[PDB]
Amino acid sequence: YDPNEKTFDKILVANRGEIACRVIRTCKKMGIKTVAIHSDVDASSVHVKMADEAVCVGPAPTSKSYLNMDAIMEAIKKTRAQAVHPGYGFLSENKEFARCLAAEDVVFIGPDTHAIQAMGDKIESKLLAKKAEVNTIPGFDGVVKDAEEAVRIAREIGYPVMIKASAGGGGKGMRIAWDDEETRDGFRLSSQEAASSFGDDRLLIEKFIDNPRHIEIQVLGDKHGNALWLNERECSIQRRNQKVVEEAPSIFLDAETRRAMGEQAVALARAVKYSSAGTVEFLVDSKKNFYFLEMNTRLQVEHPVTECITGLDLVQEMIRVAKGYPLRHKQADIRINGWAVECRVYAEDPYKSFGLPSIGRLSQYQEPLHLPGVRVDSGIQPGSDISIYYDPMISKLITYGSDRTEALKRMADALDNYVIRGVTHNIALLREVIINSRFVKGDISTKFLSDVYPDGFKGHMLTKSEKNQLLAIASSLFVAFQLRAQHFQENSRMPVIKPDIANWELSVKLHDKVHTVVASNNGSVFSVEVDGSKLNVTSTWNLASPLLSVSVDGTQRTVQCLSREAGGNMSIQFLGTVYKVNILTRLAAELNKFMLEKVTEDTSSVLRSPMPGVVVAVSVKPGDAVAEGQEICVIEAMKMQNSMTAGKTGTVKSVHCQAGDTVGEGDLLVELE
Amino acid sequence: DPSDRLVPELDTIVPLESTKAYNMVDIIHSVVDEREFFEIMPNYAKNIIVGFARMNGRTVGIVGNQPKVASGCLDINSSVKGARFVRFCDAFNIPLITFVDVPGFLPGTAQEYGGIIRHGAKLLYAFAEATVPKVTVITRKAYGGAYYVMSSKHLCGDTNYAWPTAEIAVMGAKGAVEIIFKGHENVEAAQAEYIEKFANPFPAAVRGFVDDIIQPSSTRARICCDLDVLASKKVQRPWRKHANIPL
């Protein structure tokens, strides 16, 4: 970090969120003035405040604020900006944005425009990669227009078929086929969806690869044409065409194949005169036949996972390249620094569709920065709100260690010690992935989440010892709350006679089974007997901090108490999963048998989408009651949110309406019978 | 639960524009001990929030306006509901904390025929009679009579604070312009000048009606400190058998 180099005194960072904060911080390491653009709603974000001055660029929607180029060059004129960074996606693929920046003093920090054009169309991308002497996914080169052509191409390539339209951030518009009838009907639906999404209709049909590993290679390229490959980033774990866990040093990959990968990627970059940091994605099979799948000219979303092992600041060198300086670091300078694992904590509900979009505000937000070997990148703070106008990303968590086991353990401890309240997160999913046996040993594939949980994610299944530990912790916490309730100050008129109950006899209702617990106290040590098993729980018993660390039978367990009621109900986050327990005294539980049960029935919802527009919120779940006037969700269509009356009884099988999705008329918000 | 805990989640809970609402109960949960709050009448007259909480271990009675239901406007039911709660907290030496986000009294014919004057007077009397420590925080708009109905400093209030989003005014700023500059009929710049000079706590602040303009994230800490120093408060009033509340 030499401050003598004068790359750009003033920079404009054309993005928002965690990456905006990362870029601003990197420029601060250079002592570079930062100009961060922000929407009017996002005028209170972290990056707008931390940057040296800022200019509002429009309303809440990104189409009218970040995509309305008028406000952008007005802000540039106001700030006299000199450099621009597209960030994750955003306007990286916008060639009009590139040319209008070129018309001004701002310089697009990135590769050549024609390189972005070449990666935009997948047919030309494959043709160039074959020209660039890079192994390709097998298939047909060209564009299909008719169903007969599609089925014939399936004949040459085989039944596994990747009907894939051109472009698409994060591999958008990929589909699976297995039959000639499947080939033709999928080709028809793929033409339909390509027209709906992009309209290119450049369906690049190629042979599908089963049990693959999506392995990324990062190539840093100066403006002089030199290309330098920096290790790799395995992204085998994904769902809904989105990556959740990233492993930078790939366990499957070895050194010789890695260096061959980097050599091919460097040759590909030099074949295009690459002058930025790019990513090349491969489909490694059992035989390590890494085939070229797309090439992202933008900086990768999960770049920090390798930044730890490479030991180099990718953004710093990218800015130096934007200055035009050659690559100071060589391949020998690129040395792996241990193991690194990254997980992206999102604002989605993992229990529904492996992550379902959600909206809300963050009341409590605390990161596990006190843990060793844990780093957090985020662009949100306590009180920041999740907006439908932008993607729902909370943060990214990275751990580095000597080996894989150390990194996995540090991820586990960091995810346990991470406090988020107000919105629903997918911490349970990430922790279950990082502690799953298959992911531990290494045998993972792109379909990891589809076969490990065929019926969908259902939470951690705690074992018998874990069940006893959870029951002991819950009973101890309940007794501790009671004991603190018995502590007042000195009245001097009516003295308090502290009751002398020795052993608490509780009844705990975990799931359906009912467990009898006998809990006794001694100083700060709780002796808890659950159905005969005797355990010791010791902790400071601080009943106000969100994170509580107990020591059950020597083993240290970190738990969170989300909610509690005078009726006895408790919500405990324990090993990532949130369990609801119901603790009662033996007398109260005995008397509760006389209480009449209050039952509410709600099943079999049904309705399609009879108006278009962006859904404000979702109001039903598969298996909910409807009648003449029951609304599935709230749909806004040109400044009116009509209540969409069901009027009939059917059966939901899955739901396609998610808050923040522009779902049109007749698009079947919920699919039904 | 530390007494000087910061509450940054309250930094941007008050929306910038005056036509948006928020949940005052989120503010209450952020401020009070362990985010625990026992609500009273949580389903009746939902435009006022009353309940019990703890601050540094001491029982406190929380009263506040809910800008969600009926825009937070005061009416008959909310007046009685808040008045009796304040009177009870008075009778048993329980300190009171108020969150003021009231735009004014609810207008209508049913409200007038129901005797909105009597019940508004009930709430005003309940706050003006209080001899327990009272801490008032003004999150947003406080216009009209309601500004001093909700325990203003002028009712022998102890410490009054204002968030940087407070708007203390005689009445509606547009109405104030239309009633002052009626003979001007050039409100194009008059409205801008009047909102610049009077849609801020600065008139009240320079008049000393509010003790400070606290940052939203210090609220809890500040209140805790106050609840200590005022725990010894004693005030003397003229002798009487009892007063005549507008019951």
Add this chain to the structure above:
Amino acid sequence: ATSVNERIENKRRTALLGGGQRRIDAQHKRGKLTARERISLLLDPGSFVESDMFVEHRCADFGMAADKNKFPGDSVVTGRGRINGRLVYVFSQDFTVFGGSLSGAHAQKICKIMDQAITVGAPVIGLNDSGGARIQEGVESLAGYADIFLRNVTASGVIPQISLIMGPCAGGAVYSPALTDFTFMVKDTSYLFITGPDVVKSVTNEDVTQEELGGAKTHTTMSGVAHRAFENDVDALCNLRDFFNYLPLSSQDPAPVRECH
């Protein structure tokens, strides 16, 4: 030769005439009295002692510092007197000066009267006739309202408080009569409502006139706010004297005892 003498005499003669003879003529036109003659009818002859005749509003915003907007007394007449020989403190609001709207000086004079009455232990009678709250004054008007209400609540149960609404009253000024012990009104001229009919139009769009929203009939037959309604000013004042003969001067004094037959 010192100008103090004729200055004082001119200020006196301008104060005793309110804010102009033509406005007093207009006030008589709507069948209403001025504040000073109301006080003359209420109190025993030659017993009114007035206080703070020369107190002027200190507001200096919106050109209010000009001499044309300076009126000694400032829309309130305050003092003490005797009804049937028993002491009383009385304030009356003058609609001629700025429509009787309450400003800093108005509220300060009312507060001083109330404080002196609670010191000595005599009832307070208020004749309310005021358009609303002076917006030119600013937040000082709200401060004055709240000070008056605080002293009303403090004096409740200590000294009797009687309010007679002798004209329109709107805004927060409706809360002083509601915090007093009794509240009489005059038919066809007095009004008590928080918000005028135009606001009702702007909010719920219901056609109500002033009389239907806040008339004496409304507040004496279907609202419970007011206690009695009298034909006009003279009848109301005579009945008010008769009613005052019943009450004790303070909570400490026992119930009055008269000559019986």
